[PDB]
Amino acid sequence: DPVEIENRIIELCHQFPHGITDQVIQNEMPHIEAQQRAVAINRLLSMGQLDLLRSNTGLLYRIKDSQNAGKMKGSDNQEKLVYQIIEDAGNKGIWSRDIRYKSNLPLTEINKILKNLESKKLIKAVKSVAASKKKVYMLYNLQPDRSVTGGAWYSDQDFESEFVEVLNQQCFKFLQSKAETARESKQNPMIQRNSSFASSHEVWKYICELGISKVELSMEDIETILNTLIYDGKVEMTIIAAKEGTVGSVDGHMKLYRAVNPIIPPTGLVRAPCGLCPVFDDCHEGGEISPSNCIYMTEWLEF
Amino acid sequence: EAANEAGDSSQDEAEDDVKQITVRFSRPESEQARQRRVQSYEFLQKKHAEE
Amino acid sequence: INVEIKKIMKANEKVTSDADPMWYLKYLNIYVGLPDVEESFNVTRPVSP
Ligand code: SF4
């Protein structure tokens, strides 16, 4: 009786929620040949009560998620036929529009399904900080990915410019003080350069000791802040070879940051009103915009 | 050709190509698309091969 | 007006929307009638060419 075989396979899948191999089924039921087991598995897959997984150990057969229920009003079929791609999205989330498009259902049905799932604590809706258009839906147990939502800089879908400005100012002050101490040490140029260098872990621990904000700042956060400072033309980073130490971030490589003065002072072009003029293209000898009747040069000479 | 592609290196490391669960939605197919699938050549060939 | 219009109506007798299934609009039979004028307030009247 193949029905008994299917029932036994379902019971075995109930016993092992993580899935069962063919070896487990053969050990539990040795008197049945491999062909009958294969036919039973094919029927179970055709009727939609089993799922196949390909692991490094082989094939696994897992019972389809039906016990985990959040929307029992109506049909469990649509509940699982939404929770499927809900879980498939998982940490990255998925907007309600994309859920509707993948489900090929009207907006009312999917709205009811999402509400009922939120009622029984199966899905959580979080606001997409990348593009504040709709609320993406994720699994309640899964931790929200920092890229799609959250972040040490984003606070309630609002970029904190003051926070990053304070971070940049404090890091630049620390690096400038370190470089000043290295210069005043004047023990040896190599020693001076090494002491002017500051590791990412060191400045990260310094910022943590400062405690400007309540949110915990990881090492890579301070690394990105220092990279933005590099892009500002104020500090310099060097990658040295160090196998292991107090940082242990990059394999065999450590980033050292030092405050460096600019190459040249402001050029002579910016000291003239013509170099900073926004309507410089419309300049002409005889016309409405002329150097003789210029307002910029007038205010500049008056000042 | 697939074997030759896999054989680009003499010793192939154990690939961590675990089959992530790509179970697709059994989307309710529109009647027009269902009729297109029924009238498709692959469906007719499969129905012939069923015998 | 006597045969072809009925065939055209039969070709598009049923129209329905994808959203909210089990809803439909079914045409049964179409008539052209006699020429009339809509001059009168909500009332028709025979009119000569
Ligand atoms: S408006 Fe005057 S200052 Fe400005 S670009 Fe023209 S000439 Fe130069």
XYZ file of C-alpha atoms and ligand atoms in Angstrom:
411
model
C 0.000 0.000 0.000
C 1.659 3.224 -1.179
C -0.645 5.274 1.067
C 0.949 3.677 4.133
C 4.386 4.460 2.680
C 3.426 8.111 2.196
C 2.015 8.294 5.729
C 5.211 6.784 7.151
C 7.350 9.265 5.205
C 5.170 12.110 6.505
C 5.608 10.824 10.064
C 9.381 10.614 9.573
C 9.408 14.191 8.260
C 7.447 15.194 11.363
C 10.085 13.489 13.515
C 12.911 15.421 11.785
C 11.906 19.022 10.968
C 15.288 19.621 9.290
C 14.622 16.991 6.622
C 15.422 13.309 6.117
C 17.698 11.563 3.634
C 16.926 8.385 1.706
C 19.216 6.471 4.077
C 17.003 7.324 7.063
C 13.889 6.148 5.211
C 15.672 2.945 4.178
C 16.795 2.273 7.757
C 13.316 2.927 9.175
C 11.656 0.801 6.455
C 14.088 -1.799 5.066
C 11.508 -4.250 3.670
C 10.439 -1.789 0.931
C 12.502 -1.553 -2.253
C 14.014 1.687 -3.525
C 11.593 1.971 -6.459
C 8.500 2.045 -4.234
C 10.115 4.674 -2.001
C 10.983 6.741 -5.083
C 7.402 6.509 -6.372
C 6.076 7.518 -2.946
C 8.436 10.508 -2.804
C 7.398 11.508 -6.328
C 3.718 11.387 -5.350
C 4.394 13.385 -2.172
C 6.208 16.026 -4.231
C 3.439 16.068 -6.848
C 0.740 16.677 -4.230
C 2.848 19.475 -2.729
C 3.424 18.258 0.836
C 7.226 17.878 0.563
C 10.199 20.015 -0.461
C 13.609 18.924 -1.730
C 16.952 20.242 -0.461
C 20.373 19.611 -2.024
C 23.011 19.570 0.719
C 26.627 18.417 0.736
C 25.368 15.098 2.155
C 22.847 14.555 -0.650
C 19.072 14.932 -0.915
C 16.796 15.962 1.962
C 12.993 15.763 2.051
C 11.308 18.268 4.363
C 7.642 18.668 5.244
C 6.211 21.894 3.849
C 5.644 24.620 6.438
C 1.957 24.362 7.345
C 2.061 24.224 11.147
C 3.450 27.774 11.349
C 0.210 29.667 10.722
C -0.613 33.360 10.983
C -3.553 33.677 8.570
C -5.950 30.783 9.147
C -9.047 32.793 8.182
C -10.019 31.532 4.739
C -7.435 29.083 3.398
C -4.005 27.939 4.555
C -3.060 27.653 0.871
C -2.807 31.412 0.307
C -1.192 31.838 3.730
C 1.705 29.583 2.739
C 1.602 30.919 -0.852
C 2.499 34.315 0.606
C 4.800 33.257 3.467
C 6.858 31.344 0.877
C 8.329 34.387 -0.872
C 8.105 36.319 2.412
C 10.707 33.887 3.778
C 12.547 33.807 0.438
C 13.086 37.559 0.773
C 13.910 37.221 4.457
C 16.504 39.705 5.667
C 16.424 41.949 2.582
C 12.646 42.385 2.826
C 10.170 42.987 0.026
C 7.749 45.830 -0.684
C 3.991 45.294 -0.735
C 3.935 46.074 -4.466
C 6.457 43.314 -5.186
C 4.549 40.889 -2.948
C 1.363 41.674 -4.883
C 3.136 41.263 -8.231
C 4.735 37.937 -7.273
C 1.478 36.649 -5.763
C -0.667 37.715 -8.765
C -3.439 38.678 -6.333
C -5.402 41.920 -5.923
C -4.387 44.460 -3.308
C -7.248 43.692 -0.910
C -6.438 39.983 -0.557
C -2.732 40.556 0.047
C -3.531 43.369 2.500
C -5.780 41.015 4.477
C -3.099 38.306 4.388
C -0.376 40.673 5.617
C -2.611 42.034 8.393
C -3.546 38.544 9.589
C 0.099 37.434 9.488
C 1.126 40.482 11.524
C -1.660 39.630 13.981
C -0.138 36.251 14.917
C 3.492 37.493 15.004
C 4.817 35.862 11.836
C 5.962 38.880 9.780
C 7.255 42.330 10.732
C 6.884 45.456 8.590
C 9.834 47.862 8.633
C 10.300 51.095 6.706
C 12.846 50.911 3.885
C 15.461 53.505 4.811
C 17.089 53.241 1.371
C 13.924 54.388 -0.445
C 11.131 55.533 1.892
C 8.288 54.461 -0.394
C 6.614 51.432 1.238
C 7.132 49.186 4.259
C 8.982 45.957 3.485
C 7.904 42.733 5.190
C 10.378 40.330 6.799
C 10.315 37.254 9.002
C 9.780 38.077 12.670
C 12.626 35.808 13.795
C 15.171 37.083 11.260
C 17.418 40.000 12.197
C 16.970 43.068 9.949
C 19.804 43.633 7.495
C 21.706 46.877 8.038
C 21.674 47.759 4.326
C 17.916 47.586 3.720
C 17.019 49.171 7.079
C 18.551 50.581 10.239
C 22.196 51.596 10.318
C 24.351 53.514 12.777
C 23.767 56.778 10.880
C 20.076 56.432 9.986
C 17.680 57.241 12.842
C 13.989 56.685 12.020
C 14.591 56.956 8.257
C 16.454 60.250 8.794
C 20.119 60.727 7.934
C 22.004 62.310 10.843
C 24.283 64.895 9.247
C 25.092 66.410 12.645
C 26.225 63.002 13.927
C 28.630 62.347 11.051
C 29.868 65.943 11.283
C 30.650 65.510 14.986
C 32.359 62.186 14.252
C 34.502 63.763 11.529
C 35.434 66.735 13.722
C 36.373 64.558 16.705
C 38.398 62.122 14.588
C 40.226 64.979 12.857
C 40.991 66.625 16.206
C 42.336 63.346 17.600
C 44.493 62.727 14.522
C 45.791 66.312 14.551
C 46.699 66.062 18.242
C 48.460 62.743 17.613
C 50.408 64.222 14.691
C 51.328 67.264 16.795
C 52.629 65.028 19.588
C 54.577 62.970 17.042
C 56.126 66.134 15.594
C 57.012 67.544 19.020
C 58.555 64.202 20.024
C 61.268 64.666 17.336
C 62.950 61.431 18.445
C 63.382 59.907 14.964
C 61.601 60.525 11.627
C 60.562 56.875 11.292
C 59.383 56.827 14.912
C 57.625 60.164 14.358
C 55.778 58.806 11.316
C 54.839 55.586 13.126
C 53.524 57.499 16.148
C 51.579 59.907 13.923
C 49.874 56.844 12.439
C 46.679 55.759 14.196
C 45.047 52.370 13.719
C 41.337 52.035 13.009
C 40.893 50.028 16.216
C 42.642 52.723 18.270
C 40.479 55.580 16.992
C 37.394 53.356 17.283
C 38.164 52.698 20.953
C 38.803 56.427 21.410
C 35.396 57.274 19.923
C 33.775 54.634 22.138
C 35.486 56.224 25.148
C 34.080 59.587 24.050
C 30.506 58.288 23.868
C 28.943 61.085 21.830
C 25.924 59.010 20.773
C 24.078 56.082 22.328
C 24.212 53.842 19.242
C 27.126 51.407 19.229
C 29.668 52.223 16.509
C 31.470 49.258 14.973
C 35.065 49.338 13.754
C 34.004 49.508 10.100
C 31.845 52.540 10.929
C 34.924 54.430 12.136
C 36.766 53.075 9.089
C 34.145 54.592 6.774
C 34.273 57.860 8.733
C 38.052 57.977 8.286
C 37.634 57.163 4.586
C 35.257 60.120 4.250
C 37.874 62.235 6.034
C 40.445 61.008 3.496
C 38.068 62.069 0.725
C 38.029 65.512 2.381
C 41.760 65.897 1.707
C 42.744 66.155 5.378
C 44.123 62.734 6.419
C 46.167 59.923 4.872
C 45.877 56.145 5.259
C 48.567 53.503 4.727
C 48.196 49.716 4.625
C 51.047 48.038 6.508
C 51.747 44.324 6.921
C 50.926 42.950 10.380
C 49.951 39.312 10.897
C 48.088 39.618 14.204
C 47.721 42.084 17.037
C 45.203 44.111 19.000
C 43.215 44.862 15.814
C 43.030 41.560 13.941
C 40.564 42.992 11.419
C 42.179 42.379 8.013
C 44.245 39.258 7.345
C 47.878 40.359 7.508
C 47.053 44.015 6.802
C 46.467 47.012 9.071
C 45.257 50.488 8.109
C 47.044 53.389 9.826
C 45.637 56.921 9.590
C 47.499 60.192 10.126
C 46.528 63.852 9.897
C 48.369 65.507 7.000
C 48.503 69.141 5.923
C 47.222 70.080 2.446
C 49.636 70.108 -0.477
C 49.298 73.779 -1.457
C 47.447 76.797 -0.052
C 44.343 78.076 -1.871
C 45.249 79.052 -5.420
C 45.209 82.581 -6.805
C 42.198 81.956 -9.049
C 39.795 81.586 -6.112
C 41.064 84.885 -4.679
C 39.405 86.722 -7.599
C 35.623 87.128 -8.015
C 35.863 85.917 -11.622
C 36.999 82.448 -10.537
C 34.020 81.902 -8.219
C 31.380 83.536 -10.425
C 28.318 81.364 -11.194
C 27.379 83.359 -14.321
C 30.961 83.373 -15.620
C 29.787 81.923 -18.949
C 27.581 84.953 -19.687
C 30.481 87.386 -19.173
C 31.060 89.814 -22.042
C 32.713 93.168 -22.682
C 29.644 95.050 -23.911
C 26.386 93.867 -22.402
C 24.289 93.545 -19.279
C 26.948 91.448 -17.508
C 30.199 93.384 -17.900
C 33.332 93.561 -15.731
C 32.998 97.357 -15.664
C 29.605 97.240 -13.908
C 30.126 93.967 -12.020
C 28.546 93.702 -8.574
C 30.845 90.897 -7.390
C 34.050 92.858 -7.983
C 32.375 95.992 -6.600
C 31.566 94.304 -3.282
C 34.985 92.618 -3.279
C 36.857 95.913 -3.696
C 34.568 97.647 -1.191
C 35.241 94.908 1.378
C 31.396 21.250 -22.680
C 30.104 21.473 -19.107
C 32.679 18.868 -18.054
C 35.434 20.851 -19.787
C 34.269 24.015 -18.013
C 34.410 22.182 -14.679
C 37.848 20.797 -15.587
C 39.502 24.204 -15.979
C 41.443 23.332 -12.807
C 43.071 19.949 -12.213
C 41.683 19.654 -8.665
C 38.256 21.199 -8.061
C 37.532 22.303 -4.503
C 34.278 21.124 -2.948
C 31.894 23.820 -4.163
C 29.595 25.335 -1.554
C 26.845 25.375 -4.197
C 24.126 24.237 -1.809
C 20.755 24.483 -3.514
C 19.049 27.378 -1.743
C 15.332 26.708 -1.532
C 14.107 28.280 -4.777
C 10.539 27.005 -4.496
C 8.599 29.310 -6.811
C 5.043 30.479 -6.242
C 2.449 28.337 -8.001
C 0.997 31.585 -9.301
C -2.674 31.477 -10.354
C -2.226 31.565 -14.114
C -4.435 33.855 -16.170
C -6.857 31.979 -18.414
C -5.182 33.409 -21.524
C -1.734 32.285 -20.366
C -3.172 28.905 -19.357
C -4.650 28.488 -22.842
C -1.279 29.478 -24.318
C 0.443 26.831 -22.185
C -2.121 24.197 -23.196
C -1.692 25.099 -26.878
C 2.109 25.064 -26.528
C 4.077 22.431 -28.427
C 5.917 21.263 -25.303
C 2.633 20.483 -23.536
C 1.373 18.461 -26.510
C 4.669 16.571 -26.750
C 4.578 15.783 -23.027
C 0.963 14.608 -23.310
C 1.961 12.336 -26.198
C 4.924 10.998 -24.207
C 2.640 10.276 -21.231
C 1.209 7.289 -23.103
C -27.392 45.432 -38.703
C -29.246 42.094 -38.726
C -26.580 39.355 -38.737
C -23.043 40.720 -38.450
C -23.712 42.869 -35.372
C -25.076 39.828 -33.530
C -21.939 37.860 -34.426
C -19.732 40.709 -33.178
C -21.715 40.839 -29.929
C -21.407 37.057 -29.555
C -17.636 37.232 -30.072
C -17.401 39.603 -27.083
C -20.409 38.388 -25.094
C -18.500 38.025 -21.800
C -16.118 40.604 -20.317
C -14.530 40.273 -16.880
C -11.714 41.738 -14.800
C -8.768 39.846 -13.335
C -9.148 41.425 -9.892
C -12.062 40.229 -7.731
C -12.908 36.994 -9.603
C -16.416 35.520 -10.072
C -17.481 38.943 -11.413
C -18.564 39.237 -15.041
C -20.671 41.221 -17.502
C -22.554 39.028 -19.974
C -24.293 40.345 -23.089
C -27.421 38.442 -24.132
C -28.945 40.144 -27.188
C -28.467 43.500 -28.897
C -31.083 45.503 -30.806
C -30.883 48.580 -33.008
C -34.588 49.485 -33.138
C -36.216 52.276 -35.148
C -34.682 55.736 -35.663
C -35.637 58.216 -32.950
C -34.614 61.670 -31.738
C -33.426 62.543 -28.228
C -34.879 66.071 -28.422
C -37.676 65.375 -25.940
C -36.753 65.252 -22.250
C -35.923 61.567 -21.628
C -38.500 60.617 -24.297
C -37.986 59.342 -27.839
C -39.993 60.373 -30.893
C -40.137 59.140 -34.511
C -38.290 61.536 -36.815
C -38.214 61.643 -40.616
C -34.935 61.991 -42.559
S 29.734 89.480 -13.231
Fe 31.687 90.618 -12.911
S 32.786 89.402 -11.326
Fe 31.134 88.052 -12.133
S 32.146 86.871 -13.800
Fe 31.199 88.692 -14.794
S 32.872 90.243 -14.821
Fe 33.518 88.632 -13.343
